[PDB]
Design a protein around this ligand. Structure first.
Ligand SMILES: COc1ccccc1[C@H]1CC(=O)NC2=C1C(=O)CCC2
Length: 154
């Protein structure tokens, strides 16, 4: 039993856009933009909607780069996250109620203030390799189990 999520990383030659989560689950961490997929929208629709709602940006093209399943101890639903990549954006990123966006040089990604799983799978994203991941959390800090592989088809 899974629930669909989207995660969008704006990745330009020298820099990546991240958003500081301001409230709710995972507040205080930087992450890509995304969230729950709603009924009546494609997964990629959901990804553009979340990217716009949280950063003001729209995009010409989103590219599927990964899928990650998250389990949390004691939580019935799993997160089935579809990860997207884009370089060309439309607009300038602005703060939302949810997310404060900031650019980061690729050698200054704030991994210690990001979700732990990102340290595992961000490198594959940075190499523009497609991947499948699984991460079992206990709470929001401890990864009990994980798998990670490159794929031909996300
Ligand atoms: C906006 O942040 C996310 C959107 C969709 C899925 C996951 C996320 C954020 C917040 C969240 O719930 N989980 C963590 C995030 C990651 O960067 C990868 C998994 C850990």
């Amino acid at each position: 039993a899974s629930r669909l999520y989207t995660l969008v990383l704006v990745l330009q030659p020298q820099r990546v856009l991240l958003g500081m989560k301001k409230r709710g689950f995972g507040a205080g961490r930087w992450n890509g933009f995304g969230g729950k997929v709603q009924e009546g929208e494609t997964i990629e629709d959901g990804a553009r909607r979340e990217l716009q709602e949280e950063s003001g940006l729209t995009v010409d093209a989103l590219h599927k780069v990964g899928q990650i399943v998250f389990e949390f101890v004691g939580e019935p639903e799993l997160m089935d996250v579809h990860v997207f990549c884009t370089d060309s954006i439309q607009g300038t990123p602005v703060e939302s109620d949810e997310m404060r966006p900031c650019w980061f040089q690729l050698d200054q990604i704030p991994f210690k203030d990001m979700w732990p799983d990102d340290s595992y799978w961000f490198p594959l994203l940075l190499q523009k390799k497609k991947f499948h991941g699984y991460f079992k959390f206990q709470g929001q800090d401890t990864i009990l189990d994980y798998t990670l592989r490159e794929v031909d088809t996300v």
